[PDB]
Structures are given as C-alpha cells and as structure tokens.
C-alpha cells in the first residue's frame, strides 16, 4: 500500500511512524477524499479493511459532482452496490435527496425492499404517492396509515384527498379513518363527503348519513337524517336507477309508520310493509 | 387447522405471564369471540386474570395492581375506548395501577399515538400480540374479521386484504414458502401479489439493516396456496343452503360455535352426532336425527338394564357420550322443527324452487310468483331478498321492466331500511341491472379482467357443470347436493385448480365444450386447460411460482404425495367465506384426502343471514 | 387412569386444570410438552429448578435458550454436581437461528459464563468453546482470542483446527494472533 501510493503519478509516502499514527481507514480516506476509488479499494483489500464505505463514498461522489443524468448514474451506482451487499442505497438517496437528485433517489431506494423503511425515507423526503405505494405494495396497514396521516395532516385537505384517489387502496382507508371520528359509529362527514366526491361514491355518501338515520332514534331522528341523506343522491339518473328513486320510498315509507301510530295507537314503526299489512 | 391454536395460545398467554402479580383484563368484544375459541377464561384465569372487562360498555375497576387490554388495532375505537378505561381507572385507583396493552401482530403507529395522546397512557406497557387465522374448526383457518365483507367491499377497504397476505405470510414462513401461487380477481391478485412483496421484505430486512435475512425456503409438506376474491362469484352467496348446519345458520346464525337458543353446550365437529348431521341435507337430516334418537334410546334408555358389571361397563364408559348426544339430539330436534315449520309451510321448499329453476336459465319472473309469497308470509329479511338478488345475477342483467316488480319486493320487505340495503346492494355487487354501464357479461378474448365486467354465468353454465340434477341428498358424489344441483361456481373455479381430474369432469358440460376435455384433463399445473373459463370471470389472472434453486426439488417432492405422505393445501377465500362453500369444500377435501390435506382459509365465515343484514346490523 | 384424563381434556382444550392435575400426579414428560406448546418461559424455570432432570433439560432447554439463555445456566449451575457438558453445547443450536451481531456477543456471554463457573479442563468443554468461539466471534475477534489465549494452549489441543476457523473469518490481521497464540 505504501508502494502503491508513492508512485510519481498518483500517490502520498508515508512512514512506519506516520503510517501508525493516520488510523488503517484512514489509508483508505486519503484516497477518497481525493475521489479515487479504485485505488481506495486496492489499499483496502490489502490491508484487510471495508470497502463498503469505499462504494459510499463513490456513489455519493458520482451524485454531487457528476455530470450524468440521474439516470445514468443511478444505473452505474446499483450495479456497483449489487455487488456488496451491504447498506448503502439509503445513505446514497438521502445524498441524492440533498443534492437534489430526487430522480436518482428513486431508483436507489427501490433496491430497498422493506416498506418499513422505505415509508418513513420517502416521507422524509416529503415525496408523496411513493410513500403510499411503498406501504401498499408491502401491505403494512400500519404503514398506509402513517402515510395517510402524515399526508392529511400536511395537506390542505385537497391535495389530501386527490393524492389517495390516485391509489384507490389508500383511498379506502382513508375513509376507515374517517368512518370513526370518535369510533363506535362515530362518523366524521366532514371528511367521508370529500372522500367519497373524489371516486364518485354518491350512494356511500347517503349510506353514512342514513346508518346515523337508523342509529338515530327511530323516526324522530330518522326523517331528518334520510331527508339529508337524499342531498347526497343528487346525481345522474343513470345505472342507480332503484337506489336514487329509493329516497323518495323511504320517506313515504317512514310516514305511514308515523300515520298509524299517532291514529291506530299501537306503533307500525319499524315494520316491514308486509309485516305492516300483516 | 387445529395446529395453529398452540401458536395463538402462545403468544396470548406469552404476554399475559409478562405481567407480574395479580391482574384485571380488558377484551374487545368483537375480539372476545375469537379469542374464546384459542383460550377459555379459566385459562386466562390460571395466569392471573381476576375480573374480565369489556371496553365497548366502558367497563372499569380499580380491584387489581396490573390492567392488561386486549384489542384490535386496525380502528381507533379501541384505542380511544381503552385510554377512556385508563383515565377513569388513575382517577379512581388507589395503587400503582400499571397498564398493559396487547395489540395486532404489528401495532401501528396511528393507534400508540392516539394513545399517547390521552397524556395518562406515557408509563403504558404496549406491545405486539400477533394472533391470526384462529381454528373455528378442524378443517378452517379464519382471522375472524366479521365487517371484512362489508368494508371490503362497500368502500373497497382493503384492510382485509393486507391482513390476509400478512395471516399467510405468518404461516407459510413457519411451514415453508408456498412453491406456486395462484388466484383470480381483483383482491385475489393482491394477495398473491402482497405475498411476493413480503417474502423480499423478509430479505431486505438484512439488506436494510434491521432484522436477519431469512432463508425463506420453500414447503415440503404444503402444495400450493389457491385464492379466490368474493367479487369472482356473486351467485352462490346468493342461495340458501340447504344443509343442516345451513339450517342452524340460515335460521339462527351460527358465530363462534356458540350461537342462540344455550352457551352450556357447543357444537362442532367434535360432535358425533354434528360430524354426521351437519354436512346433511334438510330433506334427509330429518331423518338422521330420528336414526340417532333411535340407536341412541337402544344404547341410552335399554340394553344396559339389569346388566352385571362384566357387560355394564361397555355402556359405561360410553355413557357421558350418550348423555351427551341425548343433550345435543334435543338441540338438533329443536333445530328440525324450525325448519318443519317452512317445509309444511311452503316457505323452504318454495325458496328452492326458485333457486333451482334460475339456476337452470328459467325465465326470472316465472319465478316471481314463488317470491312474492314468501314476502307476504314474512320469512325472515335475508330469504327473501336473497330471491330478489339472485335473479338478476344469474341473468347477467335485466331490463327495469322486470327489475321493478322484484324491486317493490324489496322496499316492501325491509320497510324504509330498503334504502340503506339497495346502497349496499349495488355497492357489494350483488344486484345487476341493464342499465347499468357495468352491465356487461365477459366475452370470449374480449380484454376481460377489468372492474368493470362481471363473470359471464349465462355462458358458464355450459362451459361448467353447473347445472346437476344427478344430485343425492343422501349420498351424495357432487357438490351441487348443498343446494341441490347448484353445483357453485365459487368451488368449480377451485376444484379444477386443486385437481386434473376435477379440471376434466367439470368442463365436460355442453356439446360444444366437452371437445375440449382431452385438454382440461392436462391442467396438471396451475390454470392450464381452464383458460377458457378464467378468462370470463370477473377479474384478473395471478399465476407466479417461487424463486431459488430448489425450487424444482420441493416442486417433485409434493407432486410425489402420497397417502402415507400426505400433502397439505391451503384454499384461501378473500372477504369472507359461506357455510356452502365450506361444506362443499370438506365434500371434495374428503375425496381428495387419501393424498392431500386440504385446509380451509378465510379472512372470515360469512353467515348466510349476514349478507343481506347489513343494512339492519348497522341500522341498529 | 391418567390416560383417561389426557384424553378427555384434549377433546374440549381445558389444559390449564390438566396442568396442575399433571403436577400432582408428576407426569414430568407432558408438563414439559405442554409448556413448549404454550412457551410459559415463568413456568419451565420454576420446574427446572425444583426438578431439573438434567437427562431432559438438554433437549428442553433447546427451546429456552432462544428467549434467554443466561438464566438457564444459574438454574443448573447449582444442581449439586453437575456435568459441564449439559451447558456448553446449547449454544451450538442457538446460533444457527441467529446471524446479527448483538446475538454472537450474547453468544460469547452465556460461554464465557458457563465455562468461568464451571471452572471444567475438560477436553470437550474447551474443544466446543474454542469451535464456537472462532466461528462466531462477533466483532472484538481480538479481546475474544486474549481470553483463549489466556487459559493456555491446552484449551486449543488441535492447532489446524483453531486455525481453519479463525483464518476463514479473517486473514492476516487476525492470523498473527492465532499464531502466536499456539
């Protein structure tokens, strides 16, 4: 190594006494700090030493001072990591992140497999829809979660809801959020509205305004709640044909029930129209 | 599936001995349940557990040092419900009241943080309790996720579904990986697919520095995973069944083995008169029970009278069983009424009429005649408008013309709810209208595997037998006896993948299909020679094997099963699985037994009154 | 009958009322089968040290030993005279469960432990130390070898044998220890 680095072309002599006192990685760093690597790993291997930080430090060299596209780069990084199966690729796509290179962290970080890490990089990136897909792929619900809050809480409600509509799965499980505010069929419609208005769910929209219908106290709370929940089937009259002429029944069929408790005394309500003429 | 019980059981009891001294213990009611069948509260008694708590109806005391919950973690409900306990408890409690929580087999951040966000849960004792599939039955893995039907499918949350990859995954990394997985539709594919993803996670945790990789070999003692997606099949969720174990669900509804009549008595197929009668047909069971009142009465009340001990002791040691079967014989008469009260009523017998002549491409409203009577006897809710669902479904789509006049059936059935169950309706696709946009059955080639096609029974029924009049309802040698000549789609399209011989009698239906069965009897791996019907079900195709140089090793290892070397196989159905199914499921792992072990998986058992109930068990 | 007993308890899963029947009438070899079952780490240890049994501990322990094998060790070391060989080899079958480093240093402990309170010149006990030692000598491979090297040659008995093992790991650096060590 020493011989190795004395050479007139490229090279530092170094004496036993000097060679004991710079640290064993330090005959490595003499060389990296000067972006040469493939000498770097010579020394390394002579002296029995790691050269994964060796890779590190040249796949972050390539990031800041290359000239390449960050696909070119990306491409000629993961080959050479592939082969030391160490980690290196997120400490390369943080790198990359900082350099700006957001492109090459990408791909860096999809020879990282475990969403469980990959989530929390990606969010700490503030890279949207990717952390989602990650945490979905893997089907880590506490992941999609994680993703889903960090996103409503970051997110001005637009962006929150239109970025999950993208990823259907994601957007279901916003609305699991969102069906328990409180829990125990403590809706939140504030946010099932927004969610439902971006994948079209008109007869959802109604269904979550007509549980609390019947949830409610019986027709007293329900023809409230029913004759709200018809606010959300004001759509096209195609396909949910029977669904959307289904509010009108409800009401008549509530009000008869009403009708022949307040004259017949004994209470219709909550009887079926067979069991009612039965 | 009983071998995973010790699993659950380990890991429940695991956590409860960490707790030191005395204890009180929080359970989840919807949780409870399952966790009833693992455990029983002297078991948890043994470690410990004073007072039992629930977290729904706020629950608390102050009677114990350590207060330990158990829920699910998958909502907030139990996170909120348990810091209300702990708040109240503090406030109350007069020592040092330390708390433990038990949460899925990944807690997740979302549920710590609401937690944490209480401000009396920052000295809480909160870690993993990683129970899944738990053995409802011998023959039936199930993760007793109850609501997966409904949210899986009405907001399409696929929580379930990442539960169930995530269930398998727990199971197969313990057994070997599966060498081949295979499925069809939509939820189906993600399964297979979030099972690929997990065994490189599995990998990367060494790539990611956290955990040590794992060798992730494939099984030598399990064939294959096959998983099939509720959206492939919304015909046979439709039917009532017809056997007996079909009668206790389809009248009273059967969870957690227990159910409502005594809770004195549970029935499963540990029973020797259930592991007879249940797999019966109602026509016959009526007269098995009477078989069994009559062996039963000679051994019971006779026979063992006046005798010595040299011949008494052989009805002895048998007594507590007849003691027992003359305890379950009275609950099993009491079944058969209920259902003497729709057969002498033309309520059952009238439902099936319509269930067979649509399944034989009747013209719908002929039927609709048989349905309007069974609405003006006021059966219960989920028989009549299984009647006014299935129709449609196996006519690939009516015009409102006809539609109509099942449609007053059903607002006239359920009363102004009608509302909320049309919603849920149309949203878990059970109902098919022409003029819907999405009323469209999948052609041959025609780019199918989209969400929005639907599977072509008009056209299966010729390409599968699905249509079987050759039934026995005594001793059967079909599947199609549970609802007598149904022969379900939801098996076929299972059968034909489990076997090369079920693959070559099944497709031999019409004139125009049997020419392929010289190629259906060559589907000896994976889909090959079901193509044709694949393609026109509902949904995409999953077919991927596992990587690795021994792959083909294990490959010969289990394709070379025997009986004394039996293979197990796993059958997975994706938001939830019927009674029907699971009894047509045993009928064909009975057959296939002297090879392969053939074990039932569900993300959970789908009651055959629970369907069509959604919109009054959340109406409530 | 005890077989009557099994039996019927199997059939409806009351294990727990089985368990202190079973202690009663001391049927050793199902209490030891149900705990694997259910992994009660409280309970094995309370058997182990009224009964021990050391012609099943070895086999019962395999289980034990992932969870935390230190304690195992002050259960038997104080088992009247007890024969070094039931502790040392345990950890054969634990580290082949285990890669990472923080199980290796948990590796050497429990040997380290085992071997200094036994205080054994026993050939087979120094043989396996020395085996699993250089196998699996996490990352102070150094401060590893000082301690071999401090108990003597004898320990080694096989110079090749330590070699092989040490070299593979690590080459020239480590070599010059080992060499000089014996």
Same mark, same amino acid.
């Given at each position: 190594?020493?011989?190795?680095?004395?050479?007139?072309?490229?090279?530092?002599?170094?004496?036993?006494?000097?060679?004991?006192?710079?640290?064993?990685?330090?005959?490595?760093?003499?060389?990296?700090?000067?972006?040469?690597?493939?000498?770097?790993?010579?020394?390394?291997?002579?002296?029995?030493?790691?050269?994964?930080?060796?890779?590190?430090?040249?796949?972050?060299?390539?990031?800041?001072?290359?000239?390449?596209?960050?696909?070119?780069?990306?491409?000629?990084?993961?080959?050479?990591?592939?082969?030391?199966?160490?980690?290196?690729?997120?400490?390369?796509?943080?790198?990359?992140?900082?350099?700006?290179?957001?492109?090459?962290?990408?791909?860096?970080?999809?020879?990282? @497999?475990?969403?469980?890490?990959?989530? @929390?990089?990606? =969010?700490?990136?503030?890279?949207?829809?990717?952390?989602?897909?990650?945490?979905?792929?893997?089907?880590?619900?506490?992941?999609?979660?994680?993703?889903?809050?960090?996103?409503?809480?970051?997110?001005?409600?637009?962006?929150?809801?239109?970025?999950?509509?993208?990823? @259907?799965?994601?957007?279901?499980?916003?609305?699991?959020?969102?069906?328990?505010?409180?829990?125990?069929?403590?809706?939140?419609?504030?946010?099932?509205?927004?969610?439902?208005?971006?994948?079209?769910?008109?007869?959802?929209?109604?269904?979550?305004?007509?549980?609390?219908?019947?949830?409610?106290?019986?027709?007293?709370?329900?023809?409230?709640?029913?004759?709200?929940?018809?606010?959300?089937?004001?759509?096209?009259?195609?396909?949910?044909?029977?669904?959307?002429?289904?509010?009108?029944?409800?009401?008549? =069929?509530?009000?008869?029930?009403?009708?022949?408790?307040?004259?017949?005394?004994?209470?219709?309500?909550?009887?079926?129209?067979?069991?009612?003429?039965? | 599936?009983?071998?995973?019980?010790?699993?659950? !059981?380990?890991?429940?009891?695991?956590?409860?001995?960490?707790?030191?001294?005395?204890?009180?213990?929080?359970?989840?009611?919807?949780?409870?349940?399952?966790?009833?069948?693992?455990?029983?509260?002297?078991?948890?008694?043994?470690?410990?557990?004073?007072?039992?708590?629930?977290?729904?109806?706020?629950?608390?005391?102050?009677?114990?040092?350590?207060?330990?919950?158990?829920?699910?973690?998958?909502?907030?409900?139990?996170?909120?419900?348990?810091?209300?306990?702990?708040?109240?408890?503090?406030?109350?409690?007069?020592?040092?009241?330390?708390?433990?929580?038990?949460?899925?087999?990944?807690?997740?951040?979302?549920?710590? +943080?609401?937690?944490?966000?209480?401000? %009396?849960?920052?000295?809480?004792?909160?870690?993993?309790?990683?129970?899944?599939?738990?053995?409802?039955?011998?023959?039936?893995?199930?993760?007793?996720?109850?609501?997966?039907?409904?949210?899986?499918?009405?907001?399409?949350?696929?929580?379930?579904?990442?539960?169930?990859?995530?269930?398998?995954?727990?199971?197969?990394?313990?057994?070997?990986?599966?060498?081949?997985?295979?499925?069809?539709?939509?939820?189906?594919?993600?399964?297979?697919?979030?099972?690929?993803?997990?065994?490189?996670?599995?990998?990367?945790?060494?790539?990611?520095?956290?955990?040590?990789?794992?060798?992730?070999?494939?099984?030598?003692?399990?064939?294959?995973?096959?998983?099939?997606?509720?959206?492939?099949?919304?015909?046979?969720?439709?039917?009532?069944?017809?056997?007996?174990?079909?009668?206790?669900?389809?009248?009273?509804?059967?969870?957690?083995?227990?159910?409502?009549? +005594?809770?004195?008595?549970?029935?499963?197929?540990?029973?020797?008169?259930?592991?007879?009668?249940?797999?019966?047909?109602?026509?016959?069971?009526?007269?098995?029970?009477?078989?069994?009142?009559?062996?039963?009465?000679?051994?019971?009340?006779?026979?063992?009278?006046?005798?010595?001990?040299?011949?008494?002791?052989?009805? %002895?040691?048998?007594?507590?069983?007849?003691?027992?079967?003359?305890?379950?014989?009275?609950?099993?008469?009491?079944?058969?009424?209920?259902?003497?009260?729709?057969?002498?009523?033309?309520?059952?017998?009238?439902?099936?009429?319509?269930?067979?002549?649509?399944?034989?491409?009747?013209?719908?409203?002929?039927?609709?005649?048989?349905?309007?009577?069974?609405?003006?006897?006021?059966?219960?809710?989920?028989?009549?408008?299984?009647?006014?669902?299935?129709?449609?479904?196996?006519?690939?789509?009516?015009?409102?013309?006809?539609?109509?006049?099942?449609?007053?059936?059903?607002?006239?059935?359920?009363?102004?709810?009608?509302?909320?169950?049309?919603?849920?309706?149309?949203?878990?696709?059970?109902?098919?209208?022409?003029?819907?946009?999405?009323?469209?059955?999948?052609?041959?080639?025609?780019?199918?595997?989209?969400?929005?096609?639907?599977?072509?029974?008009?056209?299966?029924?010729?390409?599968?037998?699905?249509?079987?009049?050759?039934?026995?309802?005594?001793?059967?040698?079909?599947?199609?006896?549970?609802?007598?000549?149904?022969?379900?789609?939801?098996?076929?399209?299972?059968?034909?993948?489990?076997?090369?011989?079920?693959?070559?009698?099944?497709?031999?239906?019409?004139?125009?299909?049997?020419?392929?069965?010289?190629?259906?009897?060559?589907?000896?791996?994976?889909?090959?020679?079901?193509?044709?019907?694949?393609?026109?079900?509902?949904?995409?195709?999953?077919?991927?094997?596992? +990587?690795?140089?021994?792959?083909?090793?294990?490959?010969?290892?289990?394709?070379?099963?025997?009986?004394?070397?039996?293979?197990? %196989?796993? %059958?997975?159905?994706?938001?939830?699985?019927?009674?029907?199914?699971?009894?047509?499921?045993?009928?064909?792992?009975?057959?296939?037994?002297? !090879?392969?072990?053939?074990?039932?998986?569900?993300?959970?058992?789908?009651?055959?009154?629970?369907?069509?109930?959604?919109?009054?068990?959340?109406?409530? | 009958?005890?077989?009557?007993?099994?039996?019927?308890?199997?059939?409806?899963?009351?294990?727990?009322?089985?368990?202190?029947?079973?202690?009663?009438?001391?049927?050793?070899?199902?209490?030891?089968?149900?705990?694997?079952?259910?992994?009660?780490?409280?309970?094995?240890?309370?058997?182990?040290?009224?009964?021990?049994?050391?012609?099943?501990?070895?086999?019962?322990?395999?289980?034990?030993?992932?969870?935390?094998?230190?304690?195992?060790?002050?259960?038997?070391?104080?088992?009247?005279?007890?024969?070094?060989?039931?502790?040392?080899?345990?950890?054969?079958?634990?580290?082949?469960?285990?890669?990472?480093?923080?199980?290796?240093?948990?590796?050497?402990?429990?040997?380290?432990?085992?071997?200094?309170?036994?205080?054994?010149?026993?050939?087979?006990?120094?043989?396996?130390?020395?085996?699993?030692?250089?196998?699996?000598?996490?990352?102070?491979?150094?401060?590893?070898?000082?301690?071999?090297?401090?108990?003597?040659?004898?320990?080694?008995?096989?110079?090749?044998?330590?070699?092989?093992?040490?070299?593979?790991?690590?080459?020239?650096?480590?070599?010059?220890?080992?060499?000089?060590?014996?």
């Amino acid at each position: 190594v020493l011989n190795a680095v004395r050479f007139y072309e490229v090279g530092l002599p170094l004496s036993y006494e000097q060679y004991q006192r710079l640290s064993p990685s330090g005959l490595i760093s003499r060389l990296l700090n000067r972006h040469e690597y493939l000498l770097a790993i010579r020394i390394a291997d002579h002296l029995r030493l790691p050269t994964d930080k060796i890779h590190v430090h040249w796949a972050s060299a390539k990031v800041r001072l290359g000239s390449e596209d960050d696909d070119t780069i990306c491409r000629k990084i993961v080959e050479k990591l592939s082969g030391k199966p160490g980690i290196s690729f997120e400490v390369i796509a943080r790198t990359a992140y900082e350099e700006g290179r957001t492109r090459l962290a990408t791909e860096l970080l999809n020879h990282e @497999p475990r969403a469980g890490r990959q989530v @929390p990089l990606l =969010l700490s990136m503030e890279e949207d829809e990717l952390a989602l897909d990650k945490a979905i792929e893997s089907g880590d619900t506490d992941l999609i979660y994680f993703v889903i809050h960090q996103l409503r809480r970051k997110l001005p409600l637009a962006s929150f809801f239109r970025v999950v509509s993208s990823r @259907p799965t994601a957007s279901a499980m916003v609305e699991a959020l969102a069906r328990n505010s409180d829990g125990d069929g403590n809706e939140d419609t504030a946010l099932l509205k927004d969610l439902y208005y971006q994948d079209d769910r008109r007869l959802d929209g109604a269904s979550v305004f007509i549980r609390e219908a019947l949830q409610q106290p019986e027709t007293r709370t329900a023809s409230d709640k029913l004759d709200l929940a018809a606010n959300l089937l004001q759509g096209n009259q195609k396909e949910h044909v029977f669904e959307l002429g289904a509010l009108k029944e409800a009401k008549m =069929l509530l009000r008869m029930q009403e009708t022949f408790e307040r004259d017949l005394t004994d209470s219709f309500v909550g009887l079926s129209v067979n069991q009612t003429m039965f | 599936a009983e071998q995973v019980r010790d699993k659950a !059981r380990k890991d429940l009891l695991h956590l409860l001995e960490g707790v030191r001294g005395k204890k009180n213990l929080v359970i989840e009611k919807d949780l409870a349940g399952p966790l009833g069948v693992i455990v029983k509260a002297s078991t948890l008694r043994d470690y410990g557990v004073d007072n039992f708590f629930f977290l729904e109806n706020k629950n608390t005391g102050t009677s114990q040092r350590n207060i330990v919950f158990i829920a699910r973690g998958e909502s907030v409900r139990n996170a909120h419900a348990i810091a209300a306990q702990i708040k109240r408890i503090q406030r109350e409690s007069q020592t040092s009241h330390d708390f433990h929580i038990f949460w899925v087999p990944r807690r997740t951040l979302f549920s710590d +943080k609401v937690l944490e966000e209480a401000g %009396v849960l920052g000295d809480a004792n909160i870690s993993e309790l990683p129970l899944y599939f738990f053995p409802l039955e011998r023959d039936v893995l199930s993760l007793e996720l109850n609501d997966s039907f409904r949210d899986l499918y009405l907001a399409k949350d696929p929580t379930p579904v990442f539960l169930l990859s995530r269930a398998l995954m727990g199971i197969q990394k313990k057994h070997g990986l599966f060498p081949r997985i295979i499925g069809k539709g939509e939820n189906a594919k993600r399964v297979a697919d979030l099972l690929s993803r997990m065994r490189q996670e599995l990998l990367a945790g060494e790539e990611a520095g956290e955990s040590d990789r794992a060798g992730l070999s494939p099984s030598t003692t399990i064939e294959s995973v096959i998983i099939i997606d509720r959206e492939v099949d919304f015909v046979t969720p439709l039917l009532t069944q017809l056997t007996y174990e079909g009668l206790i669900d389809e009248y009273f509804g059967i969870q957690n083995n227990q159910t409502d009549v +005594k809770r004195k008595i549970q029935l499963d197929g540990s029973d020797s008169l259930y592991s007879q009668l249940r797999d019966a047909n109602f026509a016959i069971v009526g007269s098995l029970l009477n078989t069994v009142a009559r062996r039963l009465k000679s051994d019971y009340e006779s026979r063992h009278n006046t005798k010595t001990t040299a011949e008494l002791k052989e009805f %002895v040691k048998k007594l507590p069983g007849y003691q027992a079967e003359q305890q379950s014989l009275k609950i099993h008469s009491n079944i058969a009424e209920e259902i003497i009260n729709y057969t002498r009523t033309e309520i059952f017998n009238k439902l099936l009429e319509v269930q067979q002549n649509l399944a034989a491409g009747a013209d719908p409203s002929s039927q609709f005649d048989s349905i309007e009577e069974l609405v003006a006897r006021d059966t219960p809710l989920p028989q009549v408008l299984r009647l006014l669902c299935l129709y449609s479904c196996i006519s690939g789509g009516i015009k409102t013309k006809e539609l109509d006049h099942f449609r007053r059936l059903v607002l006239q059935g359920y009363g102004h709810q009608h509302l909320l169950t049309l919603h849920n309706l149309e949203r878990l696709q059970m109902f098919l209208s022409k003029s819907s946009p999405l009323a469209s059955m999948i052609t041959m080639s025609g780019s199918s595997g989209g969400p929005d096609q639907k599977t072509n029974y008009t056209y299966l029924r010729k390409q599968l037998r699905l249509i079987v009049d050759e039934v026995n309802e005594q001793d059967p040698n079909d599947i199609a006896y549970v609802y007598s000549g149904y022969a379900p789609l939801s098996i076929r399209l299972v059968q034909c993948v489990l076997q090369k011989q079920y693959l070559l009698s099944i497709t031999k239906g019409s004139g125009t299909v049997i020419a392929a069965g010289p190629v259906a009897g060559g589907g000896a791996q994976g889909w090959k020679g079901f193509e044709e019907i694949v393609k026109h079900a509902r949904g995409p195709t999953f077919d991927e094997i596992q +990587k690795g140089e021994d792959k083909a090793v294990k490959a010969r290892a289990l394709l070379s099963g025997s009986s004394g070397d039996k293979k197990t %196989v796993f %059958v997975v159905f994706v938001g939830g699985i019927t009674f029907t199914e699971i009894a047509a499921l045993r009928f064909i792992a009975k057959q296939e037994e002297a !090879r392969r072990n053939i074990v039932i998986c569900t993300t959970s058992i789908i009651n055959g009154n629970r369907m069509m109930n959604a919109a009054i068990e959340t109406a409530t | 009958d005890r077989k009557t007993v099994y039996d019927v308890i199997g059939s409806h899963g009351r294990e727990e009322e089985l368990l202190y029947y079973a202690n009663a009438i001391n049927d050793y070899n199902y209490v030891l089968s149900y705990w694997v079952q259910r992994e009660r780490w409280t309970e094995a240890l309370k058997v182990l040290k009224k009964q021990t049994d050391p012609e099943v501990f070895y086999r019962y322990s395999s289980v034990l030993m992932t969870h935390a094998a230190t304690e195992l060790v002050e259960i038997l070391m104080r088992q009247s005279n007890l024969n070094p060989r039931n502790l040392i080899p345990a950890m054969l079958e634990y580290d082949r469960n285990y890669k990472g480093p923080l199980a290796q240093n948990q590796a050497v402990r429990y040997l380290l432990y085992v071997v200094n309170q036994l205080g054994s010149t026993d050939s087979a006990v120094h043989n396996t130390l020395v085996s699993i030692y250089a196998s699996h000598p996490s990352k102070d491979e150094s401060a590893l070898l000082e301690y071999l090297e401090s108990q003597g040659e004898e320990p080694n008995y096989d110079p090749d044998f330590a070699l092989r093992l040490c070299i593979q790991h690590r080459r020239v650096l480590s070599c010059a220890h080992i060499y000089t060590s014996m």
